[PDB]
Write a protein that binds this ligand. Structure first.
Ligand SMILES: CCCCOC(=O)N1CCN(c2cc(C(=O)O)c3c(C(CC)CC)nn(-c4ccc(F)cc4)c3n2)CC1
Lengths: 264, 11
């Protein structure tokens, strides 16, 4: 019944960063601990000095900046996968699924949710990092060497249009719930039940969009297509991951992420 | 076991 508020509360409880918090920082109102702007080699070094001094003490600047940024991005994804798992466990019905089916839903779902949610911490000029205390510019990322400069640019492009829909956290929580509870993931066994789980979530999303955005009459099918865009975005991103597996020596993938990427 | 299973079986 009241599936939407349980989903919204699960979202509010399990994600350290969200859109309300992110927009405070991106608008420019974070006066106490404002986001350090990382826009070149030198501001990246200052940021690392202040935010991860244990790492600079261990000679981490003796690695290329691309490798350092890669590692930061890696750790954030690992963190978010953990939050997504706890989020999913709180979606009504999820905890009753077969363990292997739960693994399947997360494996194929986490990165669609990550890049959806990544939009919240993005603006036209850059993205928040380090729990809102850093802001790495879009142009600095483009200025890195191949293939690292190729990773974030399509996410910025997705985020710009997604953000033009002006969703709030209540919308995004249901959106991410629909991404995770997807009945067409390869290898699902209880397809019938997961399909009914998604039918309920998509139903409440539709109702919620109608009352939370009464002006945008076509927002629901727009969001449905954004779901398909994200699957395309992830399939394209997986091949960038593949280029790094093969042709980058000092860019070791975290074990949890290679398990996720093993068969996509 | 696999790392995703562990996250799902955690307390
Ligand atoms: C609050 C909403 C969630 C906020 O999430 C974030 O901010 N994250 C997670 C997602 N994203 C990501 C996510 C991933 C990923 O496949 O795991 C990733 C990777 C993989 C290799 C392609 C690491 C196996 N390489 N790079 C990368 C490297 C160097 C740069 F110069 C720019 C990007 C990545 N970047 C950016 C950081």
């Amino acid at each position: 019944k009241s599936l939407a508020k349980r989903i919204y509360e699960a979202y509010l409880k399990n994600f350290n960063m969200n859109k309300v918090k992110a927009r405070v920082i991106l608008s420019g109102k974070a006066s106490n601990n404002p986001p350090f702007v990382i826009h070149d080699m030198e501001t990246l070094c200052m940021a690392e000095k202040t935010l991860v001094a244990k790492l600079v003490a261990n000679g981490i600047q003796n690695k290329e900046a691309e490798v350092r940024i890669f590692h930061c991005c890696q750790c954030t994804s690992v963190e978010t996968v953990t939050e997504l798992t706890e989020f999913a466990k709180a979606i009504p019905g999820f905890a009753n699924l077969d363990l292997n089916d739960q693994v399947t839903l997360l494996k194929y779902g986490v990165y669609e949710a990550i890049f959806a949610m990544l939009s919240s911490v993005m603006n036209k000029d850059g993205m928040l990092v380090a729990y809102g205390n850093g802001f790495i510019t879009r142009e600095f990322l483009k200025s890195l060497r191949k293939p690292f400069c190729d990773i974030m640019e399509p996410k910025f492009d997705f985020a710009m249009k997604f953000n033009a829909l002006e969703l709030d956290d209540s919308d995004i929580s249901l959106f991410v719930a629909a991404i995770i509870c997807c009945g067409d993931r390869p290898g699902l066994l209880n397809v019938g039940h997961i399909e009914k789980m998604q039918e309920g979530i998509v139903h409440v999303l539709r109702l919620h969009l109608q009352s939370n955005h009464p002006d945008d009459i076509f927002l629901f099918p727009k969001l449905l297509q954004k779901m398909a865009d994200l699957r395309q975005l992830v399939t394209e991103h997986a091949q960038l991951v593949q280029i790094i597996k093969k042709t980058e020596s000092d860019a070791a993938l975290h074990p949890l992420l290679q398990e996720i990427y093993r068969d996509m | 076991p696999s790392l995703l299973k562990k996250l799902l079986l955690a307390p």
